[PDB]
Amino acid sequence: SSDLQSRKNLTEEISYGLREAEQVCNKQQLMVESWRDFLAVNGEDKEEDSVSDLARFCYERQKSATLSELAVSAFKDAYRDVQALAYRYGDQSNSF
Amino acid sequence: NLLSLGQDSLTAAYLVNVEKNCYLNRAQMQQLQMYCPFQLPPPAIIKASPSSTEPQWTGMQLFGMLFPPGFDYTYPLNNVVVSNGELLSFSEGSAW
Amino acid sequence: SKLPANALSVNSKEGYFVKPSRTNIYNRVLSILGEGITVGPKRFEFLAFSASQLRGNSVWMFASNEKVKAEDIREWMGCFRKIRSISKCAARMGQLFSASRQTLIVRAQDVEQIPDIEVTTDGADYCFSDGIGKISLAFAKQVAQKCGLSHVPSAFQIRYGGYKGVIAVDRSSFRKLSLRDSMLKFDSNNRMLNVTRWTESMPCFLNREIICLLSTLGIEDAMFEAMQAVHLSMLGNMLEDRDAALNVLQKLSGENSKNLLVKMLLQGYAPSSEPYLSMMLRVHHESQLSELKSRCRILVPKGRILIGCMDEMGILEYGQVYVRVTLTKAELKSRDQSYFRKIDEETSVVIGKVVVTKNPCLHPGDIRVLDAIYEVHFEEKGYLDCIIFPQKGERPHPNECSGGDLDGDQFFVSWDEKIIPSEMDPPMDYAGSRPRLMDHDVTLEEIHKFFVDYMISDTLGVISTAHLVHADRDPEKARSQKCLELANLHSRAVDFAKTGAPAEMPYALKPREFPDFLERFEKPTYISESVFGKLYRAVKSSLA
Amino acid sequence: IIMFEDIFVVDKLDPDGKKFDKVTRVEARSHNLEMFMHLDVNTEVYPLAVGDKFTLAMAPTLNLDGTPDTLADKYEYIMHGKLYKISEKAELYVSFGGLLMLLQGDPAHISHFELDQRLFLLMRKL
Amino acid sequence: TNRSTVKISNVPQTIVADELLRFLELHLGEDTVFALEIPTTRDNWKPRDFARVQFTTLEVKSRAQLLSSQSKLLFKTHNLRLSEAYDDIIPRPVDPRKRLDDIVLTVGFPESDEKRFCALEKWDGVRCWILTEKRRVEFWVWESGDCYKIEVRFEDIIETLSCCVNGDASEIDAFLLKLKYGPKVFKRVTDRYRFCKEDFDFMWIRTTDFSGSKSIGTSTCFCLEVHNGSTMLDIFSGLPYYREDTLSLTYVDGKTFASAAQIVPLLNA
């Protein structure tokens, strides 16, 4: 970073990117046969249930292997963009 | 090929061919010409400023003394063109 | 004006997936449709809506009375509980609202049940008989007496008792009336006969899509430029020359039409005199110029627009049809031609290469070159103002014509010789979307939902404009996958009135640019260098 | 001795920076002849701002009346390079030791340039 | 020159809207920037390479353009290039005179044959904006918290009249807007890169009549009760079909004509 303000902006951007990646992983976790009714284009009143249950998604992911693989794939896909920020926040004279 | 440039020569060549803004004067170029087996190319930079004497050499011509006169190399991906043993163009990539 | 898509069901991203949110206008329209409109000592109720009214956001309302109520009329029209599709039920209920002429009443004692013919090739269901029928000579004479029609057409569109389709004449009829199997739409308590259109031998016209799809087979720009030049030359000479006025009136609107202006055109005074006629000619010329500026409409005297039917002969093969039309002033003046056969004084046969085209066309494979032949057996049946389609073949001709049907639809025919038939392209698939069937009868609410949702995601009018813009911009038009996708989307949007399948117009397909020959002055205008641009520049130069 | 000489006015800069410590590519459009030019210049040693007017000259040799391979006192940004690609509104591709130049103009304006030859680049910002 | 928003070509990716606002206020006049928006490819953590800035006065825009043409704007070793934008960030007129705040809005119709007017429902403290470029007039009415937007185009009006409410013929304290069609009704619904200088983080959606008595749907004329203005006539002269005559009106108690049914403009049986 050039100065302290740039460092703070980079930290906030990293935090928001991690939050977005976690949200993407949570969305990708729903690609199972159990949520076929919810994923269909109809009227479902349980939309808020899938969003408010934030602490259950991690527990469900840690129990299944296919869910874990899907989650890590989605996390890598959403984290490539986060890794791409180094070229924006890095100077041309950076040794690394 | 079995033998590569290495971990240091690769970085040095990247720095030489990427910066394109640091010009080597006659003394440094002649000092570096001792290790190179080929002769010295034309300076190609006569005046870089209205009140700048001692015409200098560009960085990419220093790397051009490492090829035989009859060797021609073309790398479309990195836009690298070598004609008559002289490096003509280079943009980025460091893949060649 | 039309309700914008943003005024109803505005999209909003709530949760993981985007869900549209209904606006207050949606609820207001639903309440108006449900409760009804009260005007004085009356309360109007929803009866039905026609296919034309569905595309214009119009609906019929009937005030309930002590004698007959809305439900009484609804059940008198027929029983619609057999249809389990929301769109199909509405279409069948609203189809019986077209203008027609009343005729005699025929009971349900003499009706035939002639079996149809079906061909299944390459795993595709191709049906030749979609809405074709059979009629006798006595029935035609009886039905033509009340309409004041002298000549007996060989084909005329008719609908009665829920049936709908065109019927053709025959010389081996058994009784007055006959019917096929693939014609019953819904059961009705009445069988009133009525006829909408019998025959219209109007001269053919070249629309924008015809030139757009015919500009890749090898047709140069010199032909269209010369045709436009001669058209404008004969239009400009119509003012000071009375001879050209009659010829134009006899070759532009109505082959055989009697009018006060038409009679005076052949024998009249100088154009300077008779202001009542001179100013009418001037305003007609101005209207023609405005129509040409708005859209391309080329007057081709060697082609007509007529419906088509089939005969129970089975002699014609795949690629052989019969073309027969009346003789106009140009045909009568010089009937000696290679592809024109003077079978009769008023009727002339055609032996040239004739193609079939419709109004909506967005696929290069619709151009199917057909060779017309002359047979004594076919002429013995006496077919007039109707092209003959073979019974047998790999696929029916209407199927190749954008998946159409023999429902009295008009067909463009032209016995031209300077076209290029060397290039042939297969037609697109005519298979529609899967029908949606409900598990319960209609409670008069889902039909209202479908009617209101018709306004939302109604992209029928923009697909054609986008296709035209993409064809004008990108060279080698109607060859890339973008044109195929646009044609598929247009077909799906047309099918939306029949089955509830939204077009789903993508955002990236919007043109965001329009050529000179459009009325979108506010939108950015770009100079087009295609054949349409050349024609528009020629028209502008002629006007100036 | 001078083959091509015209007044050029810059239009935009590729980096659009003042202290980027990197070679900057400029886009200048010729006056009268209306020939578009690409050139890599070092802003730190030879500052060039948008809207400035500078002259450009090309000569096979800096000597007077022959002697290929005294114009130094006139100009201030002399460079040396070779032309490697001439295929195109013909355009030229001259690299001054890795600094590419793209002079796109008219076929009639550029007709006395041969392939694989050494030429100089004389510049002065008025 | 038609609009006031200026699109900046290139800005650093590491900056925030606050830094750019501070830089602009330092180089230009103090608090001369109204709206600053930086588009983001992602939701809130990936701004684009360009930004759009709205200025309060056209003079500030001209000065900024002059500075940009001379390359005098240098923010974090980046030369800011200024170019015209397509649409304004906020539909707000540049002229402060056209902005009317805290005025009285009432609806009605020419109930009597004489010079009489009837008032159905009266709103106080409404905001009126006149957009010459967009050829429309916006009315902001606050009712039960949420505000509503009333949009009237130039083609909607057929004639413009001026009246008075204090009772003095010389003074002009009212304006009549005869409407041929109905006005559009909107409704307000419920940050790091968007300053906007105010609370404009919402969207407008079309809605039906929000009045309890539905006075808007049964009124074909609008009356604007505003204070006397020496130069107000020049501002009101821009409306199409303006009459340069003085007319007087009186208030008629027409609160009885109030229908709570969906079909408002029909008579009572």
Side-chain angles (χ1 to χ4, degrees), chain A residues 1-36 38-43 48 50-51 54-55 57-68 70-90 92 94-96, chain B residues 1-50 52-53 55-91 93-96, chain C residues 1-8 10-13 15-112 114-136 138 140-144 146-170 172-175 177-178 180 182-198 200-240 244-245 254 268 270-319 321 323 330 352-370 372-375 382-385 387-394 396-419 421-429 431-518 521 524-544, chain D residues 2-10 12-13 15-20 22-30 32-33 35-60 62-64 66 68 71-86 90-105 107-108 110-111 113 115 117-126, chain E residues 1-108 110 115-132 134 136-165 167 169-170 172 174-190 192-210 212 215-224 226-230 232-243 245-269:
Chain A
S1 297
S2 299
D3 51 355
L4 181 60
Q5 188 68 209
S6 300
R7 186 61 180 181
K8 295 184 178 181
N9 298 332
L10 180 59
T11 301
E12 293 282 55
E13 186 166 350
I14 290 303
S15 178
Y16 275 99
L18 292 181
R19 188 179 306 177
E20 187 269 352
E22 186 271 347
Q23 187 70 206
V24 168
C25 295
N26 293 16
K27 178 180 179 299
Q28 189 71 205
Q29 285 188 12
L30 297 180
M31 303 301 179
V32 294
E33 296 182 356
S34 180
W35 295 96
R36 292 186 298 182
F38 178 79
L39 265 59
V41 186
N42 48 15
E48 296 80 7
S50 300
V51 182
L54 186 62
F57 283 159
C58 66
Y59 177 80
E60 293 180 5
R61 183 204 300 108
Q62 293 179 354
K63 292 298 299 300
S64 300
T66 60
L67 276 68
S68 300
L70 296 179
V72 300
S73 180
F75 197 91
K76 293 181 179 180
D77 295 0
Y79 196 74
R80 291 187 298 101
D81 299 330
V82 181
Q83 294 180 355
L85 305 179
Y87 301 93
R88 295 186 178 183
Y89 280 78
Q92 292 77 8
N94 191 283
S95 59
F96 290 157
Chain B
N1 57 325
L2 180 60
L3 296 175
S4 179
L5 294 180
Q7 66 176 22
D8 194 12
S9 300
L10 172 58
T11 303
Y14 180 87
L15 285 178
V16 166
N17 295 332
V18 156
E19 296 178 354
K20 299 180 181 180
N21 61 89
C22 304
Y23 303 93
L24 303 182
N25 56 326
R26 176 171 169 265
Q28 294 175 358
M29 185 54 60
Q30 288 187 358
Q31 176 68 19
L32 295 179
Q33 198 269 352
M34 296 292 298
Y35 300 90
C36 298
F38 298 94
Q39 293 295 335
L40 201 60
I45 299 293
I46 302 300
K47 288 186 176 182
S49 297
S52 62
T53 59
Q56 302 163 327
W57 279 254
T58 175
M60 296 180 59
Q61 275 180 334
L62 176 65
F63 194 81
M65 296 184 299
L66 306 173
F67 306 98
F71 174 75
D72 295 354
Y73 180 80
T74 54
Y75 198 78
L77 180 60
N78 294 335
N79 194 20
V80 175
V81 178
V82 180
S83 180
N84 199 20
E86 294 184 354
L87 181 56
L88 298 182
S89 60
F90 169 78
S91 60
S94 69
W96 62 291
Chain C
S1 60
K2 197 65 60 181
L3 292 179
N6 58 84
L8 295 174
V10 53
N11 296 330
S12 61
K13 184 176 182 179
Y16 300 96
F17 305 96
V18 50
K19 182 186 63 60
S21 60
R22 311 298 178 177
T23 60
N24 294 331
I25 310 301
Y26 193 94
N27 300 19
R28 169 182 172 87
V29 173
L30 288 185
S31 301
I32 291 300
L33 290 182
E35 304 292 337
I37 301 179
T38 65
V39 178
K42 286 184 178 181
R43 191 169 72 95
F44 299 87
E45 308 301 323
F46 161 80
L47 275 188
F49 50 91
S50 180
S52 300
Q53 291 188 344
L54 182 56
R55 309 179 186 273
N57 298 342
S58 300
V59 66
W60 282 94
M61 288 193 179
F62 185 85
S64 297
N65 199 328
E66 307 295 333
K67 292 87 179 181
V68 182
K69 299 184 301 179
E71 296 182 356
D72 302 330
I73 302 179
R74 192 179 307 168
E75 67 183 5
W76 171 85
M77 293 184 61
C79 180
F80 303 98
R81 278 193 170 186
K82 299 181 179 301
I83 302 300
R84 291 301 184 92
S85 180
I86 308 303
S87 60
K88 293 297 182 179
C89 178
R92 302 314 172 187
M93 188 174 58
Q95 69 177 4
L96 197 60
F97 287 93
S98 300
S100 301
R101 301 301 180 90
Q102 299 300 128
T103 54
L104 295 178
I105 308 178
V106 176
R107 289 168 283 97
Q109 189 176 359
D110 45 357
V111 175
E112 294 189 359
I114 303 179
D116 299 0
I117 48 179
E118 295 79 9
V119 180
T120 301
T121 56
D122 301 330
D125 301 330
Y126 295 157
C127 185
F128 284 81
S129 59
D130 298 330
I132 197 59
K134 188 181 184 305
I135 200 59
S136 61
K141 297 297 183 301
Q142 289 292 339
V143 77
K146 293 181 175 56
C147 298
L149 187 58
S150 60
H151 60 79
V152 180
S154 301
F156 53 94
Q157 177 177 338
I158 186 180
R159 50 174 56 90
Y160 63 97
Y163 302 92
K164 181 176 58 180
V166 64
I167 57 186
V169 303
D170 198 329
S172 60
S173 300
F174 302 95
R175 48 187 175 185
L177 296 184
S178 60
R180 293 187 175 272
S182 299
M183 200 180 300
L184 177 61
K185 303 302 182 179
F186 68 100
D187 56 329
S188 61
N189 303 329
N190 50 6
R191 290 159 296 274
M192 176 69 65
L193 296 177
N194 48 45
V195 180
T196 65
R197 178 212 307 168
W198 44 92
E200 292 180 350
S201 300
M202 306 303 179
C204 73
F205 306 100
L206 297 183
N207 300 270
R208 291 184 173 181
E209 74 285 349
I210 302 179
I211 298 185
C212 176
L213 298 181
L214 285 182
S215 300
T216 61
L217 287 80
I219 298 182
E220 305 179 10
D221 197 15
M223 164 185 171
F224 293 153
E225 183 71 18
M227 188 158 51
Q228 178 64 216
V230 68
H231 174 52
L232 62 88
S233 300
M234 70 180 61
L235 177 60
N237 191 264
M238 192 192 313
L239 286 173
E240 58 180 354
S272 60
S273 180
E274 302 184 17
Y276 177 81
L277 182 60
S278 68
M279 303 193 78
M280 277 188 171
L281 292 180
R282 291 178 64 259
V283 72
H284 286 63
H285 290 190
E286 292 184 2
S287 175
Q288 290 290 343
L289 292 173
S290 300
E291 194 276 339
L292 291 180
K293 181 180 301 179
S294 61
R295 56 182 178 181
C296 184
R297 186 178 185 178
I298 302 300
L299 285 74
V300 184
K302 59 185 62 179
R304 304 298 180 88
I305 299 180
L306 294 170
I307 61 180
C309 291
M310 301 183 301
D311 296 333
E312 297 81 6
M313 302 303 300
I315 302 180
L316 303 181
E317 62 178 1
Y318 179 81
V321 294
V323 180
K353 318 298 293 184
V354 181
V355 299
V356 182
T357 317
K358 299 181 179 181
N359 300 331
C361 298
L362 295 85
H363 192 259
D366 194 15
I367 301 302
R368 312 298 293 184
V369 185
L370 300 180
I373 59 179
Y374 172 79
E375 296 292 338
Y383 64 100
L384 294 177
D385 302 330
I387 52 184
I388 306 303
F389 298 150
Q391 292 181 302
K392 292 297 299 179
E394 298 181 357
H397 295 269
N399 198 319
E400 297 182 356
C401 299
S402 68
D405 54 350
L406 296 178
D407 200 4
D409 49 351
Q410 300 180 0
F411 297 96
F412 158 78
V413 295
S414 180
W415 43 86
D416 202 344
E417 298 178 350
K418 49 190 171 181
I419 60 179
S422 61
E423 182 66 26
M424 186 63 59
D425 301 327
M428 62 179 181
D429 189 10
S433 60
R434 293 175 52 89
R436 305 183 303 180
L437 285 74
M438 306 298 298
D439 288 321
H440 55 270
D441 299 330
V442 180
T443 178
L444 207 59
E445 308 293 76
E446 39 272 10
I447 176 177
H448 286 342
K449 292 286 187 174
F450 167 77
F451 174 78
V452 180
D453 293 1
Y454 192 91
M455 311 176 185
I456 297 94
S457 69
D458 188 7
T459 61
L460 180 61
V462 300
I463 295 180
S464 60
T465 303
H467 181 268
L468 263 60
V469 171
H470 283 292
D472 295 0
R473 293 296 178 269
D474 200 319
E476 295 184 356
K477 49 187 176 300
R479 293 301 178 181
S480 61
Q481 66 280 14
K482 180 182 300 180
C483 300
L484 303 180
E485 294 177 359
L486 267 131
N488 199 331
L489 292 180
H490 181 271
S491 61
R492 189 174 184 178
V494 171
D495 193 69
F496 180 71
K498 301 172 59 181
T499 59
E504 304 177 4
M505 179 65 178
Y507 296 154
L509 204 58
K510 299 180 181 301
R512 303 186 299 102
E513 193 65 32
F514 301 89
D516 302 357
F517 42 88
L518 285 179
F521 297 98
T525 304
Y526 185 79
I527 307 300
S528 60
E529 290 75 14
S530 60
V531 290
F532 290 90
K534 296 293 299 180
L535 189 145
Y536 193 77
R537 284 180 285 268
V539 171
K540 190 71 61 180
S541 61
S542 61
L543 294 182
Chain D
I2 301 180
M3 299 181 176
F4 172 77
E5 183 175 7
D6 197 3
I7 302 300
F8 286 82
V9 181
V10 293
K12 63 179 61 180
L13 310 182
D16 284 325
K18 184 61 179 300
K19 203 62 179 60
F20 266 155
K22 192 187 301 180
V23 53
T24 65
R25 176 176 296 182
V26 300
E27 301 184 5
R29 299 186 181 274
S30 176
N32 168 70
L33 295 182
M35 309 176 59
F36 193 84
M37 184 190 62
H38 276 284
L39 180 59
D40 300 0
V41 71
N42 189 13
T43 310
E44 294 184 349
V45 298
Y46 195 86
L48 284 178
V50 56
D52 298 359
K53 302 181 180 59
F54 67 98
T55 181
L56 183 140
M58 300 181 182
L62 299 180
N63 295 328
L64 301 180
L71 302 180
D73 59 330
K74 300 180 180 180
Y75 297 87
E76 60 189 17
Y77 200 70
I78 310 180
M79 279 186 170
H80 192 192
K82 62 174 298 181
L83 173 65
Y84 61 93
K85 181 166 57 180
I86 203 180
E91 56 182 357
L92 301 181
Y93 290 82
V94 179
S95 61
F96 306 96
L99 300 181
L100 302 179
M101 187 191 67
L102 193 155
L103 180 62
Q104 180 180 180
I110 301 180
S111 299
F113 289 86
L115 186 60
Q117 66 174 5
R118 295 299 189 272
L119 51 88
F120 292 88
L121 182 63
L122 306 178
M123 295 177 57
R124 188 200 307 107
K125 51 183 302 179
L126 299 181
Chain E
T1 61
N2 302 121
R3 289 178 167 89
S4 179
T5 59
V6 182
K7 172 182 176 299
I8 309 182
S9 299
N10 56 329
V11 293
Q13 304 287 350
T14 67
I15 70 179
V16 209
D18 203 332
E19 308 176 16
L20 185 59
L21 174 62
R22 289 183 174 271
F23 178 82
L24 292 181
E25 291 183 357
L26 186 143
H27 272 251
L28 298 180
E30 184 70 19
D31 297 0
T32 52
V33 175
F34 184 82
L36 199 158
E37 177 181 354
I38 302 180
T40 60
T41 62
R42 292 298 181 270
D43 46 357
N44 204 20
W45 65 284
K46 201 169 184 178
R48 299 188 63 92
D49 190 71
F50 63 95
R52 305 185 301 107
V53 178
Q54 180 177 0
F55 298 98
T56 303
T57 311
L58 296 181
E59 179 180 355
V60 183
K61 172 183 179 181
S62 61
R63 180 171 55 183
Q65 289 287 348
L66 179 60
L67 292 181
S68 180
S69 60
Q70 300 180 359
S71 68
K72 297 185 60 180
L73 297 179
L74 186 61
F75 175 70
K76 297 185 180 300
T77 186
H78 275 267
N79 295 119
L80 303 181
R81 306 304 180 183
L82 294 184
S83 180
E84 296 291 339
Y86 297 93
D87 192 7
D88 286 349
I89 303 180
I90 297 180
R92 170 171 165 267
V94 52
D95 198 327
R97 291 159 45 88
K98 301 179 180 180
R99 307 159 187 163
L100 302 181
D101 294 354
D102 190 69
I103 59 178
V104 178
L105 171 59
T106 177
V107 300
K115 305 170 60 180
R116 305 182 64 179
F117 196 85
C118 61
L120 282 73
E121 183 171 347
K122 179 177 299 180
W123 297 277
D124 51 352
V126 304
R127 181 185 302 179
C128 175
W129 285 0
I130 301 180
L131 287 76
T132 304
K134 294 300 182 61
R136 59 184 178 182
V137 184
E138 300 180 1
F139 298 95
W140 291 24
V141 181
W142 286 263
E143 186 72 17
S144 300
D146 296 359
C147 61
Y148 303 93
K149 175 187 298 179
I150 299 180
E151 179 181 358
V152 178
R153 307 187 310 175
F154 285 170
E155 284 71 18
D156 199 315
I157 68 180
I158 53 179
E159 279 183 358
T160 304
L161 290 177
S162 60
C163 300
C164 60
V165 73
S170 60
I172 300 299
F175 290 93
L176 293 182
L177 290 80
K178 298 298 182 60
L179 298 189
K180 176 172 53 58
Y181 293 161
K184 297 181 179 60
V185 181
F186 293 86
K187 184 179 180 180
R188 181 181 59 89
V189 297
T190 301
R192 183 161 58 96
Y193 297 92
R194 298 181 58 181
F195 175 66
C196 301
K197 204 180 180 180
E198 263 173 350
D199 49 331
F200 273 83
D201 49 357
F202 56 87
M203 289 297 182
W204 296 98
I205 58 172
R206 300 196 61 180
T207 179
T208 179
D209 198 335
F210 57 92
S215 301
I216 302 180
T218 177
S219 300
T220 180
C221 179
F222 272 66
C223 180
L224 300 180
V226 79
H227 309 279
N228 301 331
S230 301
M232 192 62 60
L233 300 180
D234 300 359
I235 300 300
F236 274 87
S237 180
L239 302 181
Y241 299 153
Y242 173 79
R243 183 189 302 178
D245 294 330
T246 302
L247 191 143
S248 59
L249 287 181
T250 175
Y251 278 86
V252 182
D253 180 70
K255 195 177 298 181
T256 59
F257 286 168
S259 179
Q262 300 177 0
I263 305 300
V264 191
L266 282 188
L267 284 75
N268 195 334

